[PDB]
Enzyme design. Structure first.
Site, PDB file in Angstrom:
ATOM      1  N   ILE A  66       1.492  -8.845  11.259  1.00  0.00           N
ATOM      2  CA  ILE A  66       0.379  -7.905  11.096  1.00  0.00           C
ATOM      3  C   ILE A  66      -0.566  -8.240   9.941  1.00  0.00           C
ATOM      4  CG2 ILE A  66       1.191  -5.963  12.539  1.00  0.00           C
ATOM      5  CD1 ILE A  66       2.291  -4.622   9.996  1.00  0.00           C
ATOM      6  N   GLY A  67      -0.117  -9.060   8.994  1.00  0.00           N
ATOM      7  CA  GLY A  67      -0.953  -9.453   7.855  1.00  0.00           C
ATOM      8  C   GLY A  67      -0.246 -10.269   6.781  1.00  0.00           C
ATOM      9  N   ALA A  76      -1.255 -13.310  -0.988  1.00  0.00           N
ATOM     10  CA  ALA A  76      -1.194 -14.563  -1.753  1.00  0.00           C
ATOM     11  C   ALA A  76       0.219 -15.146  -1.895  1.00  0.00           C
ATOM     12  CB  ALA A  76      -1.808 -14.356  -3.115  1.00  0.00           C
ATOM     13  N   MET A 121       3.995 -11.891   3.347  1.00  0.00           N
ATOM     14  CA  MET A 121       3.549 -11.575   4.688  1.00  0.00           C
ATOM     15  C   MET A 121       4.076 -10.206   5.094  1.00  0.00           C
ATOM     16  SD  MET A 121       4.611 -13.591   8.174  1.00  0.00           S
ATOM     17  CE  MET A 121       3.467 -14.973   8.074  1.00  0.00           C
ATOM     18  N   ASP A 141      -8.443  -2.708  -6.749  1.00  0.00           N
ATOM     19  CA  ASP A 141      -8.687  -3.577  -5.600  1.00  0.00           C
ATOM     20  C   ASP A 141      -8.992  -2.826  -4.296  1.00  0.00           C
ATOM     21  OD1 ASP A 141      -9.165  -6.003  -4.357  1.00  0.00           O
ATOM     22  OD2 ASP A 141      -7.057  -6.533  -4.131  1.00  0.00           O
TER      23      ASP A 141
HETATM   24  C1  LIG Z   1       2.201  -1.303   4.459  1.00  0.00           C
HETATM   25  C2  LIG Z   1       1.439  -1.475   5.746  1.00  0.00           C
HETATM   26  C3  LIG Z   1       1.757  -0.652   6.812  1.00  0.00           C
HETATM   27  N1  LIG Z   1       1.093  -0.770   7.953  1.00  0.00           N
HETATM   28  C4  LIG Z   1       0.131  -1.670   8.115  1.00  0.00           C
HETATM   29  N2  LIG Z   1      -0.511  -1.730   9.353  1.00  0.00           N
HETATM   30  C5  LIG Z   1      -1.460  -2.667   9.797  1.00  0.00           C
HETATM   31  C6  LIG Z   1      -2.455  -3.184   8.964  1.00  0.00           C
HETATM   32  C7  LIG Z   1      -3.376  -4.104   9.448  1.00  0.00           C
HETATM   33  C8  LIG Z   1      -3.299  -4.507  10.779  1.00  0.00           C
HETATM   34  C9  LIG Z   1      -2.314  -4.001  11.619  1.00  0.00           C
HETATM   35  C10 LIG Z   1      -1.403  -3.080  11.126  1.00  0.00           C
HETATM   36  N3  LIG Z   1      -0.209  -2.465   7.118  1.00  0.00           N
HETATM   37  C11 LIG Z   1       0.402  -2.422   5.930  1.00  0.00           C
HETATM   38  C12 LIG Z   1      -0.093  -3.357   4.878  1.00  0.00           C
HETATM   39  C13 LIG Z   1      -1.317  -3.974   4.945  1.00  0.00           C
HETATM   40  N4  LIG Z   1      -1.497  -4.725   3.848  1.00  0.00           N
HETATM   41  C14 LIG Z   1      -0.390  -4.616   3.047  1.00  0.00           C
HETATM   42  C15 LIG Z   1      -0.289  -5.304   1.750  1.00  0.00           C
HETATM   43  O1  LIG Z   1       0.401  -4.843   0.849  1.00  0.00           O
HETATM   44  N5  LIG Z   1      -1.023  -6.433   1.601  1.00  0.00           N
HETATM   45  C16 LIG Z   1      -1.097  -7.219   0.356  1.00  0.00           C
HETATM   46  C17 LIG Z   1      -2.482  -7.893   0.332  1.00  0.00           C
HETATM   47  O2  LIG Z   1      -3.509  -6.906   0.565  1.00  0.00           O
HETATM   48  C18 LIG Z   1       0.006  -8.241   0.216  1.00  0.00           C
HETATM   49  C19 LIG Z   1       0.750  -8.656   1.320  1.00  0.00           C
HETATM   50  C20 LIG Z   1       1.749  -9.600   1.161  1.00  0.00           C
HETATM   51  C21 LIG Z   1       2.015 -10.128  -0.093  1.00  0.00           C
HETATM   52  C22 LIG Z   1       1.278  -9.716  -1.190  1.00  0.00           C
HETATM   53  C23 LIG Z   1       0.273  -8.771  -1.040  1.00  0.00           C
HETATM   54  C24 LIG Z   1       0.493  -3.760   3.652  1.00  0.00           C
END
Ligand SMILES: Cc1cnc(Nc2ccccc2)nc1-c1c[nH]c(C(=O)N[C@H](CO)c2ccccc2)c1
Length: 331
Positions: free
Chosen positions: A24-25, A28, A31, A142
């Site tokens: 889903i995403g 840095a 995932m 952010d």
């Molecule tokens: C926590 C969360 C729950 N649900 C979703 N749904 C979703 C989002 C986009 C498309 C489809 C479904 N997303 C999240 C979520 C989104 N971003 C993050 C997050 O913490 N991202 C940061 C960067 O912005 C990050 C991710 C991995 C490693 C370090 C930082 C959690």
């Protein structure tokens, strides 16, 4: 007896409890996947992070975890579970299990035109969550569409407290950072302008270029705007530039609600000392159909790191992360 899950190369060791993994995403140093929770019988979000090779990332990881564990608010993402290795020597990865949301504002504005009422509702929720964050004396730093999560019923939740504090995405970055709670209000103004047009308002390529975009709409700065202990290169550059006329909000956004543009104007105020505050934002006429101060809670007490995390070596931060997440381990 299936082994370690895998998504787009890297391993997700989330055991027998969490299965059916789907991308889903990303970030840095991690995932995010959706997963089936075989205990609660729902799909959840699982955020894998691998920050241990870097002190900065270990900082961000520990901050986020601490803040989110403490915080409790309808418009802020929570933490339900944390998974990692039984011993610190094997802990190379941390898995934060959270409520699964449907999408984010980034992807939505990619595919959908928002009506005034939904723009108004999303902004209400952003500010309602921000109020709580600010009442705890925390700055998010952010705020941007990809850090705003949405579900089917249009509920919104703010995510990604890695940069949060008691260096960020430039498009949403306050002018003064490149030259306080007011930086988060600027970002929110940037987000509002993007919901109104489906495009970033100031899509700069580097810090000076970023200032150039801002001035191309707000106009050349007043002296009172500029006198604020600025970086010498920036100030020399800004003084060198030809006059730029102010572009009227109602011309950038031709069909926008007039109340929305008045609030936009007050959020996208160059001088941070003149910029609208979160509680004031909530009380602006544009948010009137949703404004309800008895239903806009504050944090129980201000947040405090009693350790100065910035000075700490990454080995010590790893020990703190091990300790902070111990509460979620079997036993
Ligand atoms: C926590 C969360 C729950 N649900 C979703 N749904 C979703 C989002 C986009 C498309 C489809 C479904 N997303 C999240 C979520 C989104 N971003 C993050 C997050 O913490 N991202 C940061 C960067 O912005 C990050 C991710 C991995 C490693 C370090 C930082 C959690």
């Amino acid at each position: 007896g299936a082994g370690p899950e895998m998504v787009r190369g890297q391993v997700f060791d989330v055991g027998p409890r969490y299965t059916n993994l789907s991308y889903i995403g990303e970030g840095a140093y991690g995932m995010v996947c959706s997963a089936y929770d075989n205990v609660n019988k729902v799909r959840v979000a699982i955020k894998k992070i691998s920050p241990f090779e870097h002190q900065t990332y270990c900082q961000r990881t520990l901050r986020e975890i601490k803040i989110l564990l403490r915080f409790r608010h309808e418009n802020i993402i929570g933490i339900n579970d944390i998974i990692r290795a039984p011993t610190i020597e094997q802990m190379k990865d941390v898995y934060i299990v959270q409520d699964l949301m449907e999408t984010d504002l980034y992807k939505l504005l990619k595919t959908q035109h928002l009506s005034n009422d939904h723009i108004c509702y999303f902004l209400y929720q952003i500010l309602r969550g921000l109020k709580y964050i600010h009442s705890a004396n925390v700055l998010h730093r952010d705020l941007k569409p990809s850090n705003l999560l949405l579900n089917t019923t249009c509920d919104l939740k703010i995510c990604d407290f890695g940069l949060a504090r008691v260096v960020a995405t430039r498009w949403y970055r306050a002018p003064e950072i490149m030259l306080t709670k007011s930086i988060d209000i600027w970002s929110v103004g940037c987000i509002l302008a993007e919901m109104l047009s489906n495009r970033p308002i100031f899509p700069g390529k580097h810090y000076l270029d970023q200032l150039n975009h801002i001035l191309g709409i707000l106009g050349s700065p007043s002296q009172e705007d500029l006198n604020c202990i600025i970086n010498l290169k920036a100030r020399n550059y800004l003084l060198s530039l030809p006059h730029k006329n102010k572009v009227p909000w109602n011309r950038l956004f031709p069909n926008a609600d007039s109340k929305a543009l008045d609030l936009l104007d007050k959020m996208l105020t160059f001088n941070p000392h003149k910029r609208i505050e979160v509680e004031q934002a909530l009380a602006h006429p544009y948010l009137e159909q949703y404004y309800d101060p008895s239903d806009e809670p504050i944090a129980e007490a201000p947040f405090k790191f009693d350790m100065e995390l910035d000075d700490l070596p990454k080995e010590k931060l790893k020990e703190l992360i091990f300790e902070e997440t111990a509460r979620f381990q079997p036993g």
